[PDB]
Amino acid sequence: SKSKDRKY
Amino acid sequence: HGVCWIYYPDGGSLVGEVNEDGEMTGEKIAYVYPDERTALYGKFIDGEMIEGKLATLMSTEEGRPHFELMPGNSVYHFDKSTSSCISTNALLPDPYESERVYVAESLISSAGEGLFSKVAVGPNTVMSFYNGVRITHQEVDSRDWALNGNTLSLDEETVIDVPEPYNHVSKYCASLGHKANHSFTPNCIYDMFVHPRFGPIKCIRTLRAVEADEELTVAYGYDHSPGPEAPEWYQVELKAFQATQQ
Ligand SMILES: Nc1ncnc2c1ncn2[C@@H]1O[C@H](CSCC[C@H](N)C(=O)O)[C@@H](O)[C@H]1O
Domain coordinates of chain B in residue numbers?
1-78, 79-221
| Cβ B107 vs Cβ B181: under 8 Å | no
**Residues across chain A:** 8
User: How far apart (Å, rounded) are the C-alpha atoms in residues B118 and B220?
Assistant: 22
Cβ-Cβ contacts under 8 Å, B226 against chain A: 1
**Which residue among B130, B166, B172, B234 is the active-site one?**
B130
To the query of whether residue B182 is one of the catalytic residues in this protein, the response is yes
| Cβ B205 vs Cβ B211: under 8 Å | no
User: How far apart (Å, rounded) are the C-alpha atoms in residues B148 and B144?
Assistant: 7
3-state DSSP assignment of residue A3:
coil
Taking alpha carbons only, the member of B204, B211, B205, B238 closest to residue B224 is: B238
Q: By a Cβ cutoff of 8 Å, what residues of chain B touch chain A?
A: 137, 140-141, 143, 145, 148, 151-153, 156, 159, 190, 202, 218, 220-223, 226, 229
**Which is it for the CA torsion B154, B159, B14, B4, positive or negative?**
negative
B237 in a known ligand binding site = yes
Taking alpha carbons only, the member of B175, B3, B9, B181 closest to residue B100 is: B175
The CATH class of the B79-221 domain is mainly beta
User: How far apart (Å, rounded) are the C-alpha atoms in residues B147 and B220?
Assistant: 16
Taking alpha carbons only, the member of B227, B144, A8 closest to residue B239 is: B227
User: How far apart (Å, rounded) are the C-alpha atoms in residues B41 and B50?
Assistant: 10
| Cβ B82 vs Cβ B134: under 8 Å | yes
| Cβ B100 vs Cβ B121: under 8 Å | yes
Residue closest via CA to ligand 1's atom 3 equals B111
Q: Residues 6 or more apart from B245 whose CB is under 8 A from it?
A: none
| Cβ B219 vs Cβ B181: under 8 Å | no
B237 lines ligand 1 (CB under 6 A): yes
B51 lines ligand 1 (CB under 6 A): no
Specify the pairing of strand B75-76 against strand B101-105. Answer: unpaired
3-state DSSP assignment of residue A2:
coil
The number of C-alpha atoms within 13 Å of B32 and in the hemisphere containing its C-beta is: 24
Cβ-Cβ contacts under 8 Å, B141 against chain A: 1-3
Q: Could you write out the DSSP letters of every residue in chain B? A: ---EEEE-TTS-EEEE---TTS---EEEEEEE-TTSSEEEEEEEETTEEEEEEEEEEEEEETTEEEEEEPSS--EE------SS-S-S-TT---HHHHTTEEEEE-SSTT--EEEEESS-B-TT-EEEEE--EEE-HHHHHTS-GGG-SS-EE-SSS-EEE--TTTTSTTT--S--GGGPEE-SS-SEEEEEEEETTTEEEEEEEESS-B-TTPEEEE-----S----SS-HHHHHHHHHHHHHT-
One of 3.30.9.80, 2.20.110.10, 1.20.1560.10, 3.40.50.300 is the CATH number of B1-78, namely 2.20.110.10
User: How far apart (Å, rounded) are the C-alpha atoms in residues B221 and B106?
Assistant: 20
B222 lines ligand 1 (CB under 6 A): no
**Residue A7 DSSP class:** -
Task: Tell me, in Å, the resolution of the deposited structure.
Answer: 1.9
Taking alpha carbons only, the member of B24, B23, B21, B18 closest to residue B40 is: B24
Give the full edge-to-edge strand order of the sheet including B133-135. Answer: B133-135, B159-161, B152-153
Choosing among B136, B150, B157, B159, which should be mutated to test the A contact, i.e. which has the most A CBs within 10 A?
Answer: B159
Distances, alpha carbon A3 to alpha carbons A7, B11, B132, B178, in Å: 11, 26, 13, 12
**Method of structure determination:** X-ray
